[PDB]
Amino acid sequence: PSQVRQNYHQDAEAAINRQINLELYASYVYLSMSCYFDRDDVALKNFAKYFLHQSHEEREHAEKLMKLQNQRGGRIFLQDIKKPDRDDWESGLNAMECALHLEKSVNQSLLELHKLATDKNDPHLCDFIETYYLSEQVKSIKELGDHVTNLRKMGAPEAGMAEYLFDKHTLG
Amino acid sequence: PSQVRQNYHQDAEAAINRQINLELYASYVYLSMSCYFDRDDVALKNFAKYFLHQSHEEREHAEKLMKLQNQRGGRIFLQDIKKPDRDDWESGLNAMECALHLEKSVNQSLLELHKLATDKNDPHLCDFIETYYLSEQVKSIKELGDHVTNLRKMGAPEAGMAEYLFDKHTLG
Amino acid sequence: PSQVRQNYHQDAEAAINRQINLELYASYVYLSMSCYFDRDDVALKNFAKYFLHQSHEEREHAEKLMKLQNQRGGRIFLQDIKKPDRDDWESGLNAMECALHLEKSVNQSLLELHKLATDKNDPHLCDFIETYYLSEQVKSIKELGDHVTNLRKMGAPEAGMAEYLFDKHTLG
Amino acid sequence: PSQVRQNYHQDAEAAINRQINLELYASYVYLSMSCYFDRDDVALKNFAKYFLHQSHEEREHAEKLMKLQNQRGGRIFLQDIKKPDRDDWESGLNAMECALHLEKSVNQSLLELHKLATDKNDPHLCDFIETYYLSEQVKSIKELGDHVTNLRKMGAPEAGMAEYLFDKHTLG
Structure with missing residues (x-):
């Protein structure tokens, strides 16, 4: 090779x-x-x-x-x-929910990749995945869950003001 | 001449x-x-x-x-x-709607002017209209449409807080 | 709409x-x-x-x-x-040749798009294409043609030193 | 102890x-x-x-x-x-080849050390090896392989100009 x-x-x-x-x-x-x-x-x-x-x-x-x-x-x-x-994507809340599902699916693929690298005794690949991908994925998932929780509390998407004020205050 | x-x-x-x-x-x-x-x-x-x-x-x-x-x-x-x-003008939302209609009418006049200049083979006039008027008109129309959409979502003018918060956050 | x-x-x-x-x-x-x-x-x-x-x-x-x-x-x-x-992609010279073909195909699509916009009397779309896409495409095509000419003159890919020195002097 | x-x-x-x-x-x-x-x-x-x-x-x-x-x-x-x-060491190309072999042997020893530390459940030693030694070893091996490839392409050591120009442009 x-x-x-x-x-x-x-x-x-x-x-x-x-x-x-x-x-x-x-x-x-x-x-x-x-x-x-x-x-x-x-x-x-x-x-x-x-x-x-x-x-x-x-x-x-x-x-x-x-x-x-x-x-x-x-x-x-x-x-x-x-x-x-x-x-x-129909709403800010639905888009954040879909993003949360997508990031969790990417996390699941990364965890399967880490399990495969552990089984093959490839410590460099394992450490690479842990250092650059798993922590970022966990942080992104937590951030998206926080966004979804906040948008749900404010009454989105039925409350018209909710997505606007979330756009201004959280994403602004 | x-x-x-x-x-x-x-x-x-x-x-x-x-x-x-x-x-x-x-x-x-x-x-x-x-x-x-x-x-x-x-x-x-x-x-x-x-x-x-x-x-x-x-x-x-x-x-x-x-x-x-x-x-x-x-x-x-x-x-x-x-x-x-x-x-x-009765409301912020109605004023933005009227502004959108006005800008679209000005755009239609500019498009008719460009068609006339194209028919007369006046490339300087055509390029002048394209460079200084048509792009600005399209941007203004998009901006006003965004404003109208946001004001409609927040419940204006029936929701009293909507025009106030739009004044503070979007136009402020 | x-x-x-x-x-x-x-x-x-x-x-x-x-x-x-x-x-x-x-x-x-x-x-x-x-x-x-x-x-x-x-x-x-x-x-x-x-x-x-x-x-x-x-x-x-x-x-x-x-x-x-x-x-x-x-x-x-x-x-x-x-x-x-x-x-x-087999060589620097072949990659530049393929890039030249690709940019010319993108240029041909842009020219067909401009012809369509001209036929529909959409001067904003025509001016947008001319201002942001056609000049850049022509410059890119000329740059890639220059690269291909220079690599061919230096004997690439048969001459081993040619791609190395081109990498250092032209792309460096 | x-x-x-x-x-x-x-x-x-x-x-x-x-x-x-x-x-x-x-x-x-x-x-x-x-x-x-x-x-x-x-x-x-x-x-x-x-x-x-x-x-x-x-x-x-x-x-x-x-x-x-x-x-x-x-x-x-x-x-x-x-x-x-x-x-x-007879040439720049032979020296880079020997360096590549040496770094790969050091990498193999490090991988055996990591396997031993994993078997003994010493996570501190495992993490130390991954953080400070395995990534550096992989980067060094890739760099030496790149050097060997470039020197081989330019005709080293038979082409007299190859090692000189590589010394000036890559290592300079």
Whole structure:
């Protein structure tokens, strides 16, 4: 194989490629959400900024995984980026709920990847996942849960003022 | 004609004079709106500031058209500036809706002017309209649509807090 | 339709959505190229940096088109991002040649979009395409052609020193 | 034993002492390489600087392991530092290849040490190895593989200009 490859199982390499695809898909979903909130009949600028930032950070995570794959001697094999499940996210509260579900699914994939790396005795891959992905995922999940709780308390989406004031005070 | 006139049809010159009058009328309408929100029984200072700024920008657009007319060798022929349709604009939401209708009417006049300039093969006039008027009009229309959407969501004008909080957070 | 929509044909809206997908695809292709040059058996850091920058600029172009679609009252409908045609780009010279072909294909799509917007008498869309996309595309095509010419002159990829010195002096 | 010793198996302590000796040996090998490139009939100053820096960093790694051994209550037992396998490294390309083999052997020893620490349930030792040694080793291996690939492409050592230009552009 590659001259630098050492203690890098093919199963881990394939799982890393799958995780790259999942991160790109999550970036795409966040881009779709941000474009939803930019609509003239939605018009929540701070929601759009929040989700655009989320999309960019997801792209950064995917590129970091790509760098990890090249650095361990693996070979990156890209796949199609699937379109998001919907183009109409219907509310700020529903978009935050969908983002929470998406981040938890990404976390579950990362935990399966860590279990695979632990089984193959790849401590570098395990430490990489723990240091750069698991803590960030847990923080993101907690932040989204806080957002969903606050939006639910204020009466969103039935209360019209709730999403507006949340956009101004929390995301502003 | 004028020593500088070249590829400047009389139809374009008359249409430019009409557009000057329309821009002055829009400035006058915005001034009337700003004076409405300065009333002691309305008292929305940021609404008044927003519409006064809009009035000043329409005046600047009219003066730029005047400079264009003199620069191409045309002769400016002024007309009466008609009074606005009403002095009581009844709410922030109704004023934003009327502003949206007004900006769209100005956009329609600009599009007709661009079609006339295209038909007469006046690329300088076409490029001038595209560079200084059409993009600004589209941005203004999108901004007003966003304002109307947000005010409608918050329950304006039936919800008393909606126009106040919109004045503080969006226009403040 | 949307409260802000004016002089925006449905054909133009669909073509804009297609162009968004094409820009995202080109960003993906550039990401694949950048990951190719980061491999340990390729190891051309400035090539990888160049193509990563190209990917990021393509993503920015796609987001600008998304903003344009929302600003004119259109509705963004996303599609799957197809995977690039290959994961092994085989040389710096072949990657630059493929990038040249890709940029020319994007230019051809932009020219078809401009012809459609001209036929529908949408001067705002025409001016938007000319101001933000056509000049950048022409500059990018000229730059890539210059790169391909220089790499061909130096004997790439048969001459081993050529791609290395081009990486150091032109892309460095 | 020592008043501070807790969850520190004797096997781990002996393995740490062996790793200290291996790091000192690698520092010595890098010093020999740097002295080879300082010769008047070799005269590659940036190669010598690169390998001298590698020697110093290896010495730093050994001293950090010594601090870890004293901090966990272990006792450092030093051994003879074996001389390098050769004094004539014959080329820049051969020296980089030997450095790659050496770093991979050090990585293999570190992975065996991590497996031993995992088996003894010493999470502090495991985390120490992952945080300070495994990532640095992987980065060093990738860097050396990149260097070897680039030198091989440019025609080293048969092409006389290759090692000179690599010394100037990559190591300079």
